[PDB]
Write a structure and sequence with these properties.
part of a larger assembly; 3 chains; A: 106 residues; mainly beta; Immunoglobulin-like; four-stranded antiparallel sheet; 1 helix; elongated; B: 55 residues
Chain lengths: 106, 55, 97
């Protein structure tokens, strides 16, 4: 019934967000909300390289135009984060690609 | 602010929340108490005779 | 009986209102309570808890709505997790601020 551009948001751990035995690891959360129709493709990119392992995408769930939400989690390493690596979340919706870039730099 | 509040030397701080600066700067404005009062003396200096030559 | 891990996510340093996610993983049993704190004060509204899902382990995620102005003011947000009579508190803050 309607077409809306998805919104891309990326969550990053804080400076004290790493724990566990060395090397410490953390997670990245990319969530797309208020998008239609229900089908959507979520992909993870690391410095231009596609990530094919260490990620889990939650099933799409329902949050008047119908709305949906999707949650994706990618495991990251502390060493890679300290090297100023840039993580990009790739979202495909009705042939449209939206990219979001995050980094530890201020 | 009130007139009496300013004469009491209260501490006022103006903070700006901007996206560029993650840390809001703090500026303090207060009247410095304990200063003496003196009567100003107004003196008028007429132009000298060496200036009224080029007209 | 395993103590739940407490992790709090923060908005990116280069910009995003935003949301705060507190995740507890590898905990048992299934029931668990998650709340939020703001500068040591109880939060009465603006937070929601998603249904617990199965990853035997379980996973619980919560979302807290925050404003950009409050985040820049070095406000302290704490995720409170209660499990088997134990309370875990994690404090986070802006790295660049």
């Amino acid at each position: 019934v309607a077409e809306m551009n998805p919104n891309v948001n990326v969550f990053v751990p804080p400076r004290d967000g790493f724990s566990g035995p060395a090397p410490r690891k953390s997670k990245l959360i990319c969530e797309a909300t208020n998008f239609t129709p229900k089908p959507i493709t979520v992909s993870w990119l690391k410095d231009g390289k596609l990530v094919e392992s260490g990620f889990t995408t939650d099933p799409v769930t329902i949050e008047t135009p119908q709305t949906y939400k999707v949650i994706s989690t990618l495991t990251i390493s502390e060493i890679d984060w300290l090297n100023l690596n840039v993580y990009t979340c790739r979202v495909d919706h009705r042939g449209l690609t939206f990219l979001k870039n995050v980094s530890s730099t201020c | 602010i009130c007139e009496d509040d300013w004469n009491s030397g209260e501490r006022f701080t103006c903070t700006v929340t901007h996206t560029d600066l993650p840390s809001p700067l703090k500026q303090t404005i207060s009247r410095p108490k304990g200063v003496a009062l003196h009567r100003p003396d107004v003196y008028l200096l007429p132009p000298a005779r060496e200036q009224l030559n080029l007209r």
